[PDB]
Write an enzyme that holds these catalytic residues in place. Structure first.
Site, short mmCIF file in Angstrom:
data_model
loop_
_atom_site.label_atom_id
_atom_site.label_comp_id
_atom_site.label_asym_id
_atom_site.label_seq_id
_atom_site.Cartn_x
_atom_site.Cartn_y
_atom_site.Cartn_z
N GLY A 22 30.94 -7.33 0.90
CA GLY A 22 29.75 -6.57 0.47
C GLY A 22 28.80 -6.40 1.59
N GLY A 24 24.50 -5.02 2.58
CA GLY A 24 23.12 -5.16 2.08
C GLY A 24 22.15 -4.87 3.18
CG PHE A 26 22.26 -9.44 3.31
CD1 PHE A 26 23.31 -10.03 4.00
CD2 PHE A 26 22.53 -8.86 2.08
CE1 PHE A 26 24.60 -10.04 3.47
CE2 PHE A 26 23.83 -8.85 1.57
CZ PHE A 26 24.87 -9.41 2.29
N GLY A 27 22.57 -7.51 5.85
CA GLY A 27 23.76 -7.59 6.71
C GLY A 27 24.99 -7.39 5.89
CB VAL A 29 29.40 -11.40 2.73
CG1 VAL A 29 30.29 -12.59 2.67
CG2 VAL A 29 27.92 -11.73 2.52
CE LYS A 45 23.86 -15.03 4.40
NZ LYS A 45 22.85 -15.25 3.33
CG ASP A 142 15.09 -13.06 -3.50
OD1 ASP A 142 14.72 -12.34 -4.45
OD2 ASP A 142 15.60 -12.62 -2.44
C1 LIG Z 1 21.57 -10.92 -1.86
C2 LIG Z 1 22.89 -11.69 -1.91
O1 LIG Z 1 23.12 -12.25 -0.58
C3 LIG Z 1 24.24 -13.00 -0.41
C4 LIG Z 1 25.37 -12.59 -1.16
C5 LIG Z 1 26.48 -13.33 -0.97
C6 LIG Z 1 26.45 -14.45 -0.11
C7 LIG Z 1 27.35 -15.44 0.30
C8 LIG Z 1 28.71 -15.73 -0.09
C9 LIG Z 1 29.26 -16.99 0.14
C10 LIG Z 1 30.56 -17.16 -0.23
N1 LIG Z 1 31.32 -16.19 -0.76
C11 LIG Z 1 30.70 -15.01 -0.92
N2 LIG Z 1 31.48 -14.13 -1.60
C12 LIG Z 1 31.29 -12.78 -1.96
C13 LIG Z 1 32.26 -12.15 -2.73
C14 LIG Z 1 32.09 -10.81 -3.07
O2 LIG Z 1 33.07 -10.14 -3.75
C15 LIG Z 1 34.28 -10.82 -4.02
C16 LIG Z 1 30.98 -10.11 -2.65
C17 LIG Z 1 30.03 -10.73 -1.85
C18 LIG Z 1 28.89 -9.94 -1.30
F1 LIG Z 1 29.06 -9.59 -0.04
F2 LIG Z 1 28.69 -8.81 -1.96
F3 LIG Z 1 27.75 -10.62 -1.29
C19 LIG Z 1 30.18 -12.07 -1.50
N3 LIG Z 1 29.43 -14.72 -0.60
C20 LIG Z 1 26.60 -16.28 1.12
N4 LIG Z 1 25.35 -15.89 1.26
N5 LIG Z 1 25.29 -14.79 0.52
N6 LIG Z 1 24.15 -14.08 0.43
#
Ligand SMILES: CCOc1ccc2c(-c3ccnc(Nc4cc(OC)cc(C(F)(F)F)c4)n3)cnn2n1
Length: 338
Positions: A22, A24, A26-27, A29, A45, A142
């Site tokens: 994904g 954002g 924010f950057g 992932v 991330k 948040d």
């Molecule tokens: C506003 C939110 O910010 C985020 C969002 C996700 C994270 C993670 C994280 C840590 C472990 N695994 C994942 N898995 C993940 C799986 C997804 O689909 C299968 C999709 C996404 C995503 F990119 F859309 F966020 C993440 N994400 C760590 N920090 N953040 N900060």
């Protein structure tokens, strides 16, 4: 940041990108194979190289080092950070891999809400996780469905004739909490603005001082969204949000209007609000008393709405704590003896 990586690239001499999960403000992932951990799939991330997100990322690394050493078994369901590094001057944080957010699940389910048994389980885990922050002098600030991630997002699908919708149901609704870049310690500077419009507490909007109770407010808003598929505060405007609060929950307490320095929202002791304007007519159509949103008068729905009402108490001192929320009758069913 399309520039600095793509599928097949190896980050930090070990993390091979296999997917983008994904993206954002924010950057992004990415999912990587970790060649130095036996091919473990991890999330990385990659933080936007902008002052705000850099600062948040350094703060997140500090908070996760604290939470993850304090709770090394992840009993309290905060995401596990594995390490961090820099790539073309971007901060990159490595996590254990989680599935999609509760937001993305709802979206992929055609904005259908979760069924109440899943809401109960997810609510308990969110309350328990965020209560662990509150036990460690931290406020997340948040919380939102985008920051609550499923551990594993496998689902079954069946036509539901009641609503004439195909519906996805998780096999396992277990969650973890992510995104600790705004998390604030009790003794640290409290930013004026915290939270994402639809989840901001009244004491935050009215600048009365915020602490752990603003997370409780957020969680009540999250649970309504889980229940309905949509926010009951569909606005980005602070004054409209107050007007929606007044329609859904009743009048703001006089002691909060009396104290607030945010006089721009008020005319004397009333919200400066034209019920007959465009925004006034939208608020009147879109919003109604909280309990009118109930889909069932069944007692398990009353119990959820009883908890949501306590979480959406205007006064942040009166507002239910997460320690108290974990004892609420809505969670009795989770405690029925094996
Ligand atoms: C506003 C939110 O910010 C985020 C969002 C996700 C994270 C993670 C994280 C840590 C472990 N695994 C994942 N898995 C993940 C799986 C997804 O689909 C299968 C999709 C996404 C995503 F990119 F859309 F966020 C993440 N994400 C760590 N920090 N953040 N900060």
């Amino acid at each position: 940041m399309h520039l600095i990586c793509q599928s097949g690239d190896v980050l930090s001499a070990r993390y091979e990108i296999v997917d983008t999960l994904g993206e954002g403000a924010f950057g992004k992932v990415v999912e990587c194979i970790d060649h130095k951990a036996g091919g473990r799939h991890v999330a990385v991330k990659i933080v936007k190289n902008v002052d705000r997100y850099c600062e948040a990322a350094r703060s997140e690394i500090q908070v996760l080092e604290h939470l993850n050493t304090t709770d090394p078994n992840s009993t309290f369901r905060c995401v596990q950070m594995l390490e961090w590094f820099e790539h073309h001057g971007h901060i990159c944080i490595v996590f254990e891999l989680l599935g999609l957010s509760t937001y993305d699940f709802i979206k992929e389910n055609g904005f259908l809400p979760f069924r109440l048994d899943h809401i109960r389980k997810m609510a308990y885990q969110i309350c328990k996780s965020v209560n662990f922050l509150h036990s460690n002098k931290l406020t997340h600030t948040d919380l939102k469905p985008e920051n609550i991630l499923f551990v594993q997002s496998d689902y079954t699908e069946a036509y539901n004739p009641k609503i004439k919708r195909d519906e996805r149901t998780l096999i396992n609704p277990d969650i973890k909490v992510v995104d600790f870049g705004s998390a604030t310690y009790d003794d640290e500077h409290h930013s004026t603005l915290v939270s994402t419009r639809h989840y901001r507490a009244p004491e935050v909007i009215l600048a009365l001082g915020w602490s752990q109770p603003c997370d409780v407010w957020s969680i009540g808003c999250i649970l309504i969204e889980y229940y309905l598929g949509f926010t009951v505060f569909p606005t980005h405007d602070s004054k409209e949000h107050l007007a929606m609060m007044e329609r859904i929950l009743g009048p703001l307490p006089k002691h909060m209007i009396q104290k607030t320095r945010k006089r721009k929202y008020f005319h004397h002791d009333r919200l400066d609000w034209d019920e007959h304007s465009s925004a006034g007519r939208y608020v009147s159509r879109a919003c109604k008393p909280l309990k009118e949103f109930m889909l069932s008068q069944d007692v398990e729905h009353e119990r959820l709405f009883d908890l949501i009402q306590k979480m959406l108490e205007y006064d942040p001192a009166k507002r239910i704590t997460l320690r108290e929320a974990l004892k609420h009758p809505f969670f009795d069913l989770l405690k029925k003896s094996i």
